[PDB]
Every structure is written in C-alpha cells, then in structure tokens.
C-alpha cells in the first residue's frame, strides 16, 4: 500500500523533471553552432613515445606543470615521466599490481593509485630520504577503486565499484563524506575547475553531479544506453562530456540540466574508454576500444581527426593544463604525446 503509492510518486516526479527539461529545450546546440566555421582537419604527430611499462597501461594523469605525468600499469609500477625528455623521474613499485586508476596531485607532491585491492594509496614524492614512500592507504571502499582525484594535498575524491564515491581526509585517513545514489559500479569522476563540484559516471548509465562540501547529489544526467566509462568537465565548468560502452559521447549541460549534443559515428561500434577536452574546449578527444583516439568538434559534432598510433585499447588519455599536448595510454604498454604543427 504505502510502498506502491510511494513508487508511483517517483514516476510522477520523473515525468515532472522530464517535462521541465523539455520546456527549456527551445533550441539545439547543433542549430546554434551551425553558422560557425569548422575547425578543419586536426593533424597531430607522435612527438614522444614513453617506453618502459611491461604490461597494460590503465591510467595516466598530467601534472599541473604540463611537463610531468604519472602512468599506471599492471606490472605493479607507477612511473612518473618527464615528457619533454622522456626521462623517467620515478618508478613506484605497487604493493598490489591490479591498479586501475592513478592521480597526480595539483601541488605535485603526491600521487595516488588503487585497483582491485579496494585501497587508495597516497605516495609522497618529496621526502628527505630521496625515495617515494606510501604516506596513506585509504581503506573503506568495499569494491575496486575505479577513479581518484586530488582536491588538494589533504583531500581526494575516490569512486569505487561498490556504487559509491567518497571524499577523504588524507591526514586522518578517514572518509569525511560518502556520496551514495548510484545503482551500479561508479567507473569515473571528474572535478570541476573550482573543485566545488564533481561529476561521476556509473554502470547504471547515469551521471550524477555532486556537491563536495554539502555531500549530496544535485542533478542526475541520463541518456546513455550502457555503462559510462569516462567523464570530463568542460573547461569553464558549466558542462561535461561522457563516454560509454554504447560507442557514444554526450555533452551534458549543468545549468540546462540536459544533454546538448551526441558524438557518434556509424563506423564506431566499440566502447569508449577516456574523454578529455582541449584547453578552449572546442575539441573533444575520446579514446576507443578500436585502438584509436578520435578528435571531435565539440560544437558541431564533427570528427576532426584521428590519432592512430596504438596496437591495443586506448585505455586513458589526458590534455595538459596549458593545452600544448595530449597523452594517450594504451594496453600495448606505450604512452604517446601528440600535438600539431603549423
């Protein structure tokens, strides 16, 4: 009786939200940006190939100086690369080799990683002893760690396969806030540029916008037909793009609370692993299962170019903060740095 009545009210509320989004859908982003000229053909060359990982690369993250990056492989090694020289700055042996994510702190003093061991390990890069040591092991998730991102040297957000995201106080080792509401494994998270919000994509094909300080879900974004594997905020923080196993990328707007544009092609039938934006946000770069990275025109939904330089899955990618280059990691154990030439 009471349970049946309540679940009927949820359906009425869902229709109310769907009607509200349709009311403000006066135009389409495609119609708005039809007049502007296309970006043309984007040609990028492999400037660097980072060799040394002996297994599948699962994650990479640029440092904020746009020169150092950290990559994770399931050979149990975290490696920090000098991308300008291809020099290896550090090689961090992992206690558990089943790593799925890695993060570089914005300060550059810490890196984080974790996988099937259900632990987010924080590594101190600046020690008087001259070696990288574990400073914290964040336990508390009951599923695998899928993504992690530093807010500062003391705060980090983790998404897990136990359907929850958590905000951690690194100094005390305790999760201050727990973000619940996903009905599937949360696969990714992205921080807003002001680090007041973050979006997460789960295997329930939905993206939720979370308030870091308040600790609740502000908005829920649906439209994908399969698990979301990747998510990335727009550079101004007012939009985000997702990548799913249904071979599509969608651009959702925070303020309009709805999808604005879909980025898919008939030839593309493989899942999407990673998404990122260029510095101005005009380009959406997506890594795919078909061994390629497709550069999209964000405004016009045109495939601007292809980065074809890997013989296995493109597992991760990232664009520098200055926008100078894009790094692609792959299951073939190589990282490549790309940018164009005049």
């Amino acid at each position: 009786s009471e349970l049946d009545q309540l679940r009927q009210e949820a359906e009425q509320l869902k229709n109310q939200i769907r009607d509200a989004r349709k009311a403000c859908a006066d135009a389409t982003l495609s119609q708005i940006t039809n007049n502007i000229d296309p970006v043309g053909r984007i040609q990028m060359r492999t400037r660097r190939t980072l060799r040394g990982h002996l297994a599948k690369i699962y994650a990479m993250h640029w440092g904020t100086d746009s020169r150092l990056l950290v990559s994770a492989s399931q050979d149990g090694k975290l490696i920090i690369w000098d991308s300008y020289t291809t020099n290896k700055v550090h090689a961090i042996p992992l206690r558990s080799s089943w790593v799925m994510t890695c993060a570089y702190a914005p300060s550059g003093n810490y890196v984080a990683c974790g996988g099937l061991d259900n632990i987010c390990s924080i590594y101190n890069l600046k020690t008087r002893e001259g070696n990288v040591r574990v400073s914290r092991e964040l336990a508390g998730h009951t599923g695998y760690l899928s993504c992690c991102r530093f807010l500062d040297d003391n705060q980090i957000v983790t998404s897990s396969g136990d359907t929850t995201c958590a905000l951690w106080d690194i100094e005390t080792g305790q999760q201050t806030t727990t973000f619940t509401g996903h009905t599937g494994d949360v696969m990714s998270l992205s921080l807003a540029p002001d680090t007041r919000l973050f979006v997460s994509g789960a295997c329930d094909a939905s993206a939720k916008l979370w308030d870091v300080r308040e600790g609740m879900c502000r908005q829920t974004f649906t439209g994908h037909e399969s698990d979301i594997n990747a998510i990335c905020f727009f550079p101004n923080g007012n939009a985000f793009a997702t990548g799913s196993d249904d071979a599509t990328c969608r651009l959702f707007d925070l303020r309009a609370d709805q999808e604005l544009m879909t980025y898919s092609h008939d030839n593309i039938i493989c899942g999407i692993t990673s998404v990122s934006f260029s510095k101005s946000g005009r380009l959406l770069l997506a890594g795919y299962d078909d061994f390629n990275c497709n550069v999209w025109d964000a405004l016009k939904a045109d495939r601007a170019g292809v980065l074809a330089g890997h013989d296995n899955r493109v597992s991760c990618l990232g664009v520098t903060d200055d926008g100078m280059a894009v790094a692609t990691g792959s299951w073939d154990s190589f990282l490549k740095i790309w940018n164009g030439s005049s």
């Binding site: 040394g52 002996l54 050979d75 149990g76 090694k77 490696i79 000098d82 020289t85 291809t86 020099n87 290896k88 700055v89 550090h90 090689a91 042996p93």
Partner: peptide, 23 residues
C-alpha cells in the same frame, strides 16, 4: 644535470627489466 637525469632514467630502466624478468 641533464646528463645525470638521463643516467638516472637508465638506472630505472635497468631495474624495470629485472622486475619484468622476475615477474
């Protein structure tokens, strides 16, 4: 210092190969 940094990377590469053979 660049030559010393390159030499450090070679040392890391040597240990990565030894770990790969052991694994």
């Amino acid at each position: 210092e660049d030559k010393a940094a390159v030499e450090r990377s070679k040392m890391i590469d040597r240990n990565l190969r030894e770990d790969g053979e052991k694994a």
